[PDB]
Swiss-Prot record, chain A:
Membrane topology qualifier: Single-pass type I membrane protein
Annotated consequence of substituting residue 506 to A: Abolishes responses to both ssRNA and chemical ligands
Boundaries of the shown chain within the full protein: 32 to 816 of 1041
Tissue note: Expressed in myeloid dendritic cells, monocytes, and monocyte-derived dendritic cells.
Record protein name field: Toll-like receptor 8
Disulfide bonds: 5-18, 138-144, 214-227, 217-224, 411-441, 708-735
Gene name of the record: TLR8
Curated annotation (Swiss-Prot), chain B:
Gene name linked to the record: TLR8
Family classification: Belongs to the Toll-like receptor family.
Residues of the full protein shown: 32 to 816 of 1041
Phylogenetic classification of the source organism: Eukaryota, Metazoa, Chordata, Craniata, Vertebrata
Keywords of this entry: Disease variant, Disulfide bond, Endosome, Glycoprotein, Immunity, Inflammatory response, Innate immunity, Leucine-rich repeat, Membrane, Receptor, Repeat, Signal, Transmembrane, Transmembrane helix, Ubl conjugation
UniProt name for this protein: Toll-like receptor 8
One of the protein's GO biological processes: canonical NF-kappaB signal transduction
A GO term for molecular function: pattern recognition receptor activity
């Protein structure tokens, strides 16, 4: 097996992963046929022309974040690598562009360094460069020099498609840029003025990022320097006249008050326009520029609020009706009190508008009937408002917003999604969900809802398939709760412990049995320790129950038989999570009453000192058993007699100091065994060896206190004989003794 | 030195604490002059006449919870040679019988939580000096157990017996022939359905009688509950308590009572505490003829007497509650009613000593708060866990039917009148919310789903609040004048109000902290604070303690950001600062140097610090406690005396320190290096040092441990706790043993 790297052939190329292995130098034991080498997050301090000596087929090298506790690179160190195309050298404290880089380079990343001069000696010979990243070298309150770009430095790069110079002090757009450019990033570069000459001849440019130039600095979560008097970026009327192929334009945080419509007259394919963190409330109301954007699919006008103004309504121009290709509209942080039906008339005839994002607007009232008149809304995102009852910075990420999905894909897969989470809908009245479309995914998480659901609250939206009611104070005091949602498949009641933790009040979970199609139920972190009248959970359909963060230590108290069959009635259950239940021991009768249909059982992060392995005989379909983070001291020596279906056995973070002789004899089905972070001093050959067919492909042993005397030789010989079983984190499978090998890996 | 027990002389008697040290047998290395020995929570399986050999002055032995799983076997007359043994605790030992041949000198015997189903003369009649006898919790709930047989006249010879507890046992009848010396008789959950005139005859010295759980109210019981035939009441004869003239405590909780016979208290002039929780007494609370017979009553508990299925508009209390002149506390939880009007509590307003009113868990929606002004001297108004909205396993030595903990935190109640409105729905505090309230000094509004922007006017009608708890809300700190109307505020708790702080796009204002002239304690824990608007610094001339745990100083002290570099410098009087749980991998030197120089206690535990610049302790001449536990520190400075001459406590447990430097000062009393990677302590490293913790280190017990062992013998003044957990990791033949073996 390879060491220190994890070498894998996927598919024509051979990849070597040597990241985060505290390597002081590049290892001279890397496979000769490796093509892509990842040495990021190590303590490597020096690179010479001998560092990559016998690796002639090397096309990619990643030396990011080296050292971790600056990287010294000699001139022409990678010059013998005639096949090197991609070289990542980010966060290396490099003071200059390395001299003598190979002419074969197609991608070069020098992000997060101290490089303040872009010179011809450094990059003019790299005529094959397609992607060049020099972002985040001088920014924020970092002590750094102004970025000098030598005249015509990028001119010879006739194949350059991507150039990123963001988060550097430039002041001006660098002149003499190659016409082959497709993507030009100049975000946070202190460029206050864009003339007609700056983007001249860039007829192939599909993306231009000019965000953070003359930024809007009020309430900035980062060091922010505005232009003189909080002034706007000055973009000439003809600045984008040759940008005929532009698809992406980012003007976020450029302190814009006006959008010149003439900017888009020669830009017929503009698809994505970011105008977040500007002063465009006036332009949103009048919007002459909206008539010039027929192909636009994504428009972001978030956080354009006027400081000190909380208006009653949102003023949307009738020209929003000209955005025929619009798919998503982001209007977060506009800030207004009420959304009326007539306010969104300009968007109601757009055929592909599937997403409307109105989060963080402090909205108190909404006429929900307005969403019905839309052509085909699929995501109505109203999270984080004040709706009451109806009466450090990652350089390869978006700096001004999270690119994550608004709704969970598992919820949105069912159909129309309505997100009303993080609001104040503390009580759902009889007409709360009146006049809403056929909502399939509904999120009412964190609404301070302390009501007793009784089977009538969701009757106007009866086709909800995924319901999220997490982080509320729900009072489960009625057996008919949620039963009106006949087709409900996923129900999340996590973090509704308020009333469950009070013994004196009544608790009713009988409604679970009345669903014919309920598949997933999450009752996590509810502190459930007592139920009224019905002590059992029953369901002919339920497939998964998450019961983590409850009190099975109390429910399965030795002197109490009432909750002994609490899960037996879940006749179709395949996945059960009993983690975080403070279980010191599970009664044998309680374990025997778990559904026999179980394929995955999690009992991790409890306090189990013992586990009766014999009881696995009554679970003929158990594939995954997870007992991590317990206090188990012993393992059974005849697991084959108790199970013939177990594929994954997780036992990490326990107190197992001995692996029984013949532990894996005749098991056959076991593929993954995790014994990491236990107290194993050694592994005897007999504890792993087998006389039957073995499907063991993964064995984890990192974090065990291994005594590296000659007694560890039988295990090392076993490792050499069984290359098919992968032992991950081989550098963390460290010797604890003797002294002369205390920090070394087992392989030595 | 002591091993395995922690022997201490406090004051005339010598105590030995050997609890929870996985002892397989009683240790033969206990001090000869020990008087009280605690061997509870061990794996001891056998007790013989040789177990306590040479411990002649032993007056107390506690062998509770032994064995604590992989029953205690006691030979007949095992403790018979101990001529001074008075107290013997043998709880949770799976004992099938009362041990034979127990010594006649016993004054207290506890056999709680065993399998003893027969109380025989051979077992206890010779124990004529017994004052306290506990035999509770031997047969109860769904435990498989036999009915409790009490031999006739078994307690008769115990002429000095003052306390007898037989609770949580199947008795069916009150045992006859009880000694007249009895003061306290516990018969809770004993299946005694009827009390006749003869049962408590001649018990003229009885001060306490507990008959709770006999014919229990079983609806919504958090434990196995068997009601009497048809949910019937306990049947207590009119003259059952005729001779109980000295009764001070009477517990009739969960006896399914519908009527209280007033004649029960005609010969009971000193009754002080009466528990009537979990009964069916809504009718008796409204009419209450028995209330005229209770002039000396100080505590009355009528909790959880609600009618199932009835949520009335009002609470009906009888005018006879005005006859409870000695009343100090009234508990009316679980009565269940919608609104509390001012005329509803008129019968209590002239009671002089009524300092506590407890109305928790009643589902109250509205209260006329002006009603509490007319009370003589209410000190605790407990309204927690209701539905108040804006103005238009079982421990045997604990109370089974309620928590005996204080209703309010003593630190809050020490300032004066306390009003607890926690766990309610006061999501917004309007202008007249606190109108007509008394001079409230301690206010708790924790967990009220309050998402409002406090602006400096919400608490103007109660301006003398000194301790304010606003924990577990969604408060929007968006106004510099918040809480400034509380000009005498000393303690402010804003823990768990992260809702708006976690959103970068909304504004966050903490400037109000500087405007308080007497603010002493401020808790901003678990607020996820990572960004502030306009003012990046916390300032206060008075603040003494700041709890900033569970925030994001890793983001605030980002290397490329100087805005929060002096975030705490302006807290000029700060002595205690908690920076735990802030995900700090490193603290910039400039940020550490800007911490208040007045600090005496600095906690930076449970972060991810890989390095700590010890040199910077020079700018903290008053630092007494430095807590760096639960970090990833690998190294310690070799010249701590040059950086500090005031440090008394240094906590470094749960780090990755594998070596103690040479010369490891005079001010240091407590050094905690437990749960680190120390293999040995060399002669180079080896004074006010009185405590040194080293448990959980992987000690190589081979050669250099002899030097540390010699140092331990030379310095008996420094205590090393948990000596059984200071275990050898190597070699194999001593892998589980303590280093002192
Ligand atoms: C209350 O309880 C519910 C039920 O458990 C929780 O919801 C589930 O949360 C889990 C964990 O986030 C979800 O599982 C994850 O789904 C991801 C997406 O799956 C898609 O892609 C896979 C292929 O990768 C498709 O087969 C599938 O059909 C999906 O459309 C996966 O990417 C996740 O990773 C898996 O693989 C990786 C290895 O690649 C492993 O490391 C992971 O451990 C895992 O095996 C993962 O499977 C699950 O989908 C959710 N279910 C539902 C119904 O939503 C709630 O989150 C919980 N609530 C709270 C508040 O905690
Ligand atoms: C305003 O009103 C609110 C709401 O009623 C009050 O909040 C309660 O405050 C109390 C006291 O601080 C809280 O009780 C504490 O709970 C902690 C967490 O629970 C533990 O439970 C078990 C043990 O039963 C543990 O195994 C488990 O790991 C949990 O962490 C406890 O840790 C606390 O224990 C304290 O006492 C023990 C000794 O008994 C010590 O060993 C501990 O070190 C510690 O000192 C404690 O029990 C309670 O949870 C709060 N309730 C809610 C709903 O928040 C406010 O106190 C009140 N404010 C004022 C001013 O009165
Ligand atoms: C209904 O609406 C609610 C509310 O909007 C939705 O709830 C959110 O759901 C998402 C997706 O599940 C949650 O995101 C998770 O966040 C986890 C991180 O949480 C913290 O704790 C970690 C340690 O336990 C810690 O590592 C982590 O820090 C790191 O990441 C942070 C960014 O994620 C970063 O700021 C830190 O610097 C650090 O790098 C966290 O602080 C993460 O582990 C999960 O993978 C996941 O991303 C949100 O937290 C939920 N929000 C709330 C308010 O509850 C819900 O999904 C909606 N339901 C549906 C059906 O769509
Ligand atoms: C927010 O931060 C607050 C400030 O730290 C937290 O309040 C503090 O909590 C600590 C820990 O519980 C308390 O300290 C304990 O006090 C008790 C009692 O001390 C007093 O009484 C004893 C006699 O019983 C007496 O000997 C003392 O001298 C005291 O006067 C001690 O027994 C403990 O060992 C420990 O010292 C603080 O008292 C308390 N401060 C205040 C002002 O309340 C608060 O809990 C935090 N909030 C949350 C939600 O976590
Ligand atoms: C993107 C949100 C950014 C900030 C900007 C504030 O410069 N807004 C808000 N930030 C926070 N943290 N909270 C709220 C908030 C809570 C409830 C209802 C509306 C709310 N807004 C909206 C808003 C309100 C005002 C009136 N607030 C005054 C001052 O304090 C007493 C009130 O009387 C003025 C402008 C305004 O947004 C433009 C905010
Ligand atoms: C000590 C509390 C014990 C239980 C007893 C329940 O027999 N009460 C409650 N237990 C919980 N968990 N919640 C609530 C609750 C929430 C809001 C307002 C009042 C509330 N009560 C009070 C109560 C209500 C009814 C009406 N309930 C029906 C059923 O479902 C629809 C409602 O219309 C009848 C009797 C009654 O108390 C006796 C309770
Ligand atoms: C490395 O480069 C140096 C000159 O900088 C040269 O002397 C040496 O021979 C080179 N070695 C290899 C392996 O290329
Ligand atoms: C890089 O190190 C080499 C020696 O390994 C030396 O010749 C060169 O000058 C160093 N450069 C810098 C900037 O340290
Ligand atoms: C330009 O390169 C020279 C030579 O290394 C250096 O002195 C100068 O500082 C560089 N420019 C900037 C702005 O750093
Ligand atoms: C524009 O890009 C194409 C490749 O897509 C290339 O052939 C063409 O020469 C480029 N134009 C200029 C002027 O560089
Ligand atoms: C709405 O926007 C239009 C277009 O700019 C403007 O004329 C009108 O005054 C605005 N009205 C309000 C109340 O904002
Ligand atoms: C609308 O969306 C569909 C599906 O994504 C696409 O094929 C179509 O061309 C789009 N039309 C317009 C007008 O945007
Ligand atoms: C649930 O509430 C409805 C009224 O909303 C009522 O008809 C039903 O009886 C309640 N369930 C119970 C068992 O109280
Ligand atoms: C459960 O389903 C049955 C059959 O459809 C129905 O009769 C019953 O009323 C439902 N229960 C509730 C509480 O709605
Ligand atoms: C049982 O669960 C399976 C999925 O594992 C599902 O296909 C089936 O329909 C469920 N049966 C019932 C009765 O709901
Ligand atoms: C495992 O469970 C069986 C069946 O309840 C029981 O007979 C056996 O003793 C259990 N094993 C242990 C060690 O408790
Ligand atoms: C207690 O153990 C002793 C031997 O140590 C034996 O004589 C006696 O019979 C045992 N009693 C029981 C009940 O096991
Ligand atoms: C009642 O108690 C006193 C001691 O307080 C004792 O002297 C007296 O004899 C006791 N009465 C009876 C009848 O036992
Ligand atoms: C009130 O308390 C005082 C002091 O404890 C006590 O003397 C007085 O008798 C009590 N009042 C009544 C009426 O019991
Ligand atoms: C705080 O709110 C009050 C009104 O409740 C207002 O007078 C004051 O100006 C607010 N503070 C700020 C700075 O907005
Ligand atoms: C504290 O400052 C606020 C904001 O200016 C002010 O409203 C308040 O009156 C000040 N406090 C006092 C005691 O004057
Ligand atoms: C400073 O704190 C002390 C307590 O440590 C207190 O006595 C003093 O009054 C405080 N000073 C001010 C200015 O509040
Ligand atoms: C400790 O802080 C001082 C002052 O900032 C600095 O000079 C010194 O280098 C620091 N020590 C380390 C090891 O960073």
């Amino acid at each position: 097996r390879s060491y220190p790297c994890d070498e894998k052939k996927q598919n024509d190329s051979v990849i070597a992963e040597c990241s985060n292995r505290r390597l002081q130098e590049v290892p001279q034991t890397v496979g000769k046929y490796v093509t892509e080498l990842d040495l990021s997050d190590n303590f490597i301090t020096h690179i010479t022309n001998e560092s990559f000596q016998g690796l002639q087929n090397l096309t990619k090298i990643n030396l990011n974040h080296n050292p971790n506790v600056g990287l010294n690179i000699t001139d022409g160190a990678f010059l013998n690598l005639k096949n090197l195309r991609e070289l990542l050298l980010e966060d290396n404290q490099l003071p200059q562009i390395p001299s003598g880089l190979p002419e074969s380079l197609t991608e070069l990343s020098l992000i997060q360094n101290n490089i303040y001069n872009i010179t011809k000696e450094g990059i003019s010979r790299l005529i094959n460069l397609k992607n060049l990243y020099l972002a985040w070298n001088c920014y924020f309150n970092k002590v750094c020099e102004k970025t000098n770009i030598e005249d015509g430095v990028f001119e010879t790069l006739t194949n350059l498609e991507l150039l990123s110079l963001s988060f550097n002090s430039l002041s001006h757009v660098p002149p003499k840029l190659p016409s082959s450019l497709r993507k030009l990033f100049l975000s946070n570069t202190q460029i206050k003025y864009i003339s007609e000459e700056d983007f001249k001849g860039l007829i192939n440019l599909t993306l231009l990022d000019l965000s953070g130039n003359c930024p809007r600095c009020f309430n900035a979560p980062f060091p922010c320097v505005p232009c003189d008097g909080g002034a706007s970026i000055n973009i000439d009327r003809f600045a984008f006249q040759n940008l005929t192929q532009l698809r992406y334009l980012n003007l976020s945080s450029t302190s814009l008050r006006k959008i010149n419509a003439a900017w888009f007259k020669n830009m017929p394919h503009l698809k994505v326009l970011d105008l977040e963190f500007n002063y465009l409330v006036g332009e949103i109301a009048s919007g002459a520029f909206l008539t010039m954007l027929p192909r636009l699919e994504i428009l972001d006008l978030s956080f354009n609020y006027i400081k000190g103004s909380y208006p009653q309504h949102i003023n949307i121009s009738r020209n929003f009706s000209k955005l025929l290709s619009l798919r998503a509209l982001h209007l977060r942080g506009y800030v207004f009190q009420e959304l009326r039906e007539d306010d969104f008339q300009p968007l109601m005839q757009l055929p592909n508008l599937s997403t409307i994002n109105l989060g963080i607007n402090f909205i108190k009232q909404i006429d929900f009937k307005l969403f019905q008149n839309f052509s085909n809304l699929e995501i109505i995102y109203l999270s984080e408002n004040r709706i009451s009852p109806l009466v450090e910075f990652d350089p390869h990420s978006n700096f001004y917003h999270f690119t994550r999905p608004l709704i969970k894909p598992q919820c949105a897969a069912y159909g129309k999604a309505l997100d009303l989470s993080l609001n104040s809908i503390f009580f759902i009245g009889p007409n709360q969900f009146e006049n809403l479309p056929d909502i399939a995914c509904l999120n009412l998480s964190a609404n301070s809802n302390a009501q007793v659901l009784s089977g009538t609250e969701f009757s106007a939206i009866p086709h909800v398939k995924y319901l999220d009611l997490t982080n509320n104070r729900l009072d489960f005091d009625n057996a008919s709760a949620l039963t009106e949602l006949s087709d409900l498949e996923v129900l999340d009641l996590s973090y509704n412990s308020h009333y469950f933790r009070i013994a004196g009040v009544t608790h009713h979970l009988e409604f679970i049995q009345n669903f014919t199609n309920l598949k997933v139920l999450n009752l996590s972190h509810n502190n459930i320790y007592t139920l009224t009248d019905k002590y059992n959970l029953e369901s002919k359909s339920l497939v998964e129950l998450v019961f983590s963060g409850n009190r099975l230590d109390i429910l399965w108290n030795d002197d109490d038989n009432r909750y002994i069959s609490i899960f037996k009635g879940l006749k179709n259950l395949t996945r059960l999570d009993l983690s975080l239940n403070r279980l010191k021991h599970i009664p044998n009768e309680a374990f025997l009453n778990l559904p026999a249909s179980l394929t995955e059982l999690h009992i991790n992060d409890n306090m189990l000192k013992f586990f009766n392995w014999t009881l696995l005989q009554q679970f003929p379909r158990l594939e995954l058993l997870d007992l991590r983070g317990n206090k188990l001291l012993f393992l059974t020596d005849s697991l084959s007699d108790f199970t013939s279906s177990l594929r994954t056995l997780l036992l990490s973070h326990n107190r197992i100091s001995h692996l029984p002789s013949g532990f894996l004899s005749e098991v056959s089905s076991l593929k993954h065994l995790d014994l990491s972070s236990n107290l194993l001093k050694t592994i005897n050959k007999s504890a792993l060896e087998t006389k039957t067919t073995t499907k063991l492909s993964m064995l984890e042993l990192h974090g065990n206190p291994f005594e590296c005397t000659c007694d560890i030789g039988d295990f090392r010989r076993w490792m050499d004989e069984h290359l098919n079983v992968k032992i991950p984190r081989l550098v963390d499978v460290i010797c604890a003794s003797p002294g002369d090998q205390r920090g070394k890996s087992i392989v030595s």
